[PDB]
Amino acid sequence: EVQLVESGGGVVQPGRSLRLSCAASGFTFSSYAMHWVRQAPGKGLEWVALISYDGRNKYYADSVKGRFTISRDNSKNTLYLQMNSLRAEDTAVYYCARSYPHKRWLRPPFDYWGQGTLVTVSSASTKGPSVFPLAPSGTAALGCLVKDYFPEPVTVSWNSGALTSGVHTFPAVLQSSGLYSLSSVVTVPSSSLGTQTYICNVNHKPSNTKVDKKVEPK
Amino acid sequence: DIQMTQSPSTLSASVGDRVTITCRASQSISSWLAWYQQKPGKAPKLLIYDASSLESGVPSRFSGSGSGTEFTLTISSLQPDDFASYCCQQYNSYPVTFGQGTKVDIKRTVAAPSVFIFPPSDEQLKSGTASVVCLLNNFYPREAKVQWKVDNALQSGNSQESVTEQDSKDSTYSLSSTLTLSKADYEKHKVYACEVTHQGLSSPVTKSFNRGEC
């Protein structure tokens, strides 16, 4: 029952530090070379670093050399990635991966991975969103625009979770300003407008912002 | 580092289909190539290593082939669990490298988008900013072009869009496009239009509003 569980990801500003952990279970961790691999938004997987079974040999990708340090605690079945001097381009999901057993640890396939932990490096600062109605103008669409917030994520529900069918909450896009913007829409029977009230419930926990915006015909 | 080029970027398939994804290497990697399966929020999974060997317990409907510089992953009788992304990896030489990935989505009949346009709210115009939203609802396939027009003037560089994941029940997508202008420039013009082209439409659909006089 091999399992790898990464933790420690978060949102920081350029130049700062983050320590990632990966807890391993279900195998003799101390007999395997271990790796970190990362995947930036909309890009391919990129190998970052590796460490030998006994922690004596470590190798690093050129893009992180001198800024990251891979390490391991074999008595705790844990692998670590300490980052400092982080850059925007270090933003990625970071994966812990096991080196294929009898394959050269320097260039192996990886037979087990974790679910990953997300690292976000940005000069933006925490900010709650503005929520604006997308007013409906026999099927009618309406929604809420969740603009200018940082960092991810926000959650949007409709009618406190009572309204689920026909709801589409879109992935946020990152604007020029460095802030996110998201839209959430729902289609309803034109004839229901005025009968049901429609409320997007918006929550951005990083800024402790909760907004309930009611959407009216204009 | 060895560059790995995967093709195609995406493909659609039905259950029972035979699906082929290729990966090419900038220099031969002999047979040192692995294939992985990736699903959102889950751990990557090793399917095939050494170009052709299946990992223990991997279903035999997966096969791998190739040697040198060109490589093939084939899923022969695709099953519902196989809708996912797939990436190759070389381990011939030290910095291991991966392809960009290939997404396999569910095939269905063509479905035209229902299009809606939303003017900026008066509360937003207060801020000094105008966001105009165009919604393309429940269409297939994923490929769609959204074109913003302001008093017939083609817009470029001032819009962003995002697309949902394929819907579990009806296998469609929806798309949101946002056009951003200053409040000053929004008030300079009258007609805001999003023109949508898609396979489900015999001809492009335009939805518009007239800023004033409404």
Domain boundaries, chain A: 3-121, 130-215
Sequence-distant (≥ 6) Cβ neighbours of residue B40 within 8 angstroms: B165
Q: Which helix (H) or strand (E) holds B36?
A: strand B33-38
- Fold match flag (A3-121 vs A130-215): yes
CA angle, A84 then A52 then B96, to 5°: 75
Q: Which of B41, B87, B124 sits opposite A45 (nearest CB)?
A: B87
Mention the CATH class of domain A3-121: mainly beta
Contacts of A46 in chain B (CB under 8 A): 98
Q: What are phi and psi of B72, to 5 degrees?
A: -135, 130
Sequence-distant (≥ 6) Cβ neighbours of residue B83 within 8 angstroms: B13, B104, B105, B106
Question: Distance, in angstroms, between B89 CA and closest chain A CA?
Answer: 8
Q: Which of A107, A111, A181 sits opposite B92 (nearest CB)?
A: A107
Contacts of A108 in chain B (CB under 8 A): 91, 96
Domain A130-215 has CATH 2.60.40.10: yes
Report the distance separating Cα A92 and Cα A89, nearest Å.
Answer: 8
Q: How does strand A34-39 pair with strand A45-51?
A: antiparallel
* B residues 139..178 contacting A (CB < 8 A): 160-164, 174, 176, 178
Chain A residue with the nearest C-alpha to that of B38: A115
- Fold match flag (B4-106 vs B114-210): yes
Inter-chain contact A47–B95, Cβ cutoff 8 Å?
yes
Report the distance separating Cα B33 and Cα A36, nearest Å.
Answer: 19
Report the distance separating Cα A12 and Cα A1, nearest Å.
Answer: 34
Inter-chain contact A107–B91, Cβ cutoff 8 Å?
yes
Contacts of B23 in chain A (CB under 8 A): none
Report the distance separating Cα A218 and Cα B155, nearest Å.
Answer: 26
Closest residue by Cα to residue A122 from A146, A164, A82, A151 = A151
Tokens 């992180």 correspond to A64
Sequence-distant (≥ 6) Cβ neighbours of residue B188 within 8 angstroms: none
* CATH number corresponding to B4-106: 2.60.40.10
B34–chain A Cβ distance below 8 A for any pair: yes
Experimental technique: X-ray
Biggest distance spanned by C-alpha atoms of chain B = 69
Question: Mapping DSSP to helix (H, G, I), strand (E, B) and coil, where does residue B17 land?
Answer: coil
Joined together, the tokens standing for residue B20 give 């082929």
- What ranges do the domains of chain B cover? 4-106, 114-210
Tokens 């913007």 correspond to A181
Report the distance separating Cα B75 and Cα B64, nearest Å.
Answer: 9
Which listed CATH number (1.10.3210.10, 2.60.40.10, 3.40.640.10, 3.20.20.30) goes with B114-210?
Answer: 2.60.40.10
Q: How does strand B191-197 pair with strand B205-210?
A: antiparallel
Report the distance separating Cα B78 and Cα B16, nearest Å.
Answer: 5
Question: Mapping DSSP to helix (H, G, I), strand (E, B) and coil, where does residue B8 land?
Answer: coil
